């Protein structure tokens, strides 16, 4: 379902799966997508998150605190959570409603906030970033 | 959305198990090759078994090239950049052939198109040239 994803939006997902692999996690969840948005660095999502004071180490530290330690020999298959798949689907639906034929980093962050009830949304409101503020930051940076 | 088939998924699982068995710190192309043979049922397995590429023949050649590590890794094992390139080429191969899935046959095709890692070195040393492995897969399809 990544047909209209931009090269940097594709990069976001790649970094997400590499974070889940490094952190010894069994799924690619919404919080790994959030980490990938920050890791990408250059897109509208990364700039928006930086203007809100959301750092890579703060999200990663909050994620390890919630999930905890895993197995010594986990299964090598790391699929998306159903919640992360819904975020990706809502990313497409957000960009379609805006009249865009592409899906960039800003649409993935918007879709993440739209779902707004997983690990990523939980880590965001813990780091002092209410979800409605993240959306307005993304929208106001897309205006100019 | 995931394009990898169930058996291609099983190959990746076995590849991580195989690297941990050898106390290796990466999932390389040679562990992907061992996952193809370990899976057994797919097209890639039946092909390699035709060219005379046994499961112990590859494990033996891997031991001579790299050998056992000192400590067994814990958690997930990262892919080599070369193994990531193999998986990327497996997708490009399936797209060029007009398929929407990534099966074991596309993983072996992407493995030989990269053709410059431990797996490619092992295959040649076992007597199977890279172009001959490619055709045993294509005519089987």
């Amino acid at each position: 379902m990544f047909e209209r994803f931009t090269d940097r939006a594709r990069r976001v997902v790649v970094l997400a799966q590499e974070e889940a692999r490094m952190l010894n996690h069994n799924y690619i969840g919404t919080e790994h997508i959030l980490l990938g948005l920050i890791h990408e660095g250059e897109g509208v999502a990364a700039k928006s998150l930086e203007s809100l004071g959301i750092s890579l180490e703060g999200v990663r530290s909050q994620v390890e605190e919630i999930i905890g330690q895993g197995q010594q020999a986990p299964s090598g298959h790391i699929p998306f959570t159903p919640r992360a798949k819904k975020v990706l689907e809502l990313s497409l639906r957000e960009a379609l409603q805006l009249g865009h034929n592409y899906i960039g980093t800003e649409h993935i962050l918007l879709g993440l906030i739209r779902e707004g009830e997983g690990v990523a949304a939980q880590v965001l409101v813990k780091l002092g970033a209410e979800l409605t503020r993240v959306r307005q930051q993304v929208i106001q940076l897309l205006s100019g | 959305f995931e394009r990898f088939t169930d058996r291609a998924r099983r190959v990746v699982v076995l590849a991580q198990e195989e690297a941990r068995m050898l106390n290796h710190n990466y999932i390389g192309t040679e562990h992907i090759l061992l996952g193809l043979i370990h899976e057994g049922e797919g097209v890639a397995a039946k092909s390699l078994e035709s060219l005379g590429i046994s499961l112990e023949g590859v494990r033996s050649q891997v031991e001579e090239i790299i050998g056992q590590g000192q400590q067994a890794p814990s958690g997930h094992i990262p892919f080599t950049p070369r193994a990531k390139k193999v998986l990327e080429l497996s997708l490009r191969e399936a797209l060029q052939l007009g398929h929407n899935y990534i099966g074991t046959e596309h993983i072996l095709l992407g493995l030989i198109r990269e053709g410059e890692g431990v797996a490619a070195q092992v295959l040649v040393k076992l007597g199977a040239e890279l172009t001959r492995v490619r055709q045993q897969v294509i005519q089987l399809l």
Binding site: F2, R10, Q17 | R3, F4, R9, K84, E88, L91, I102
Partner: peptide
């Protein structure tokens, strides 16, 4: 698992 290198 996504595979875009």
């Amino acid at each position: 698992l996504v595979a875009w290198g």
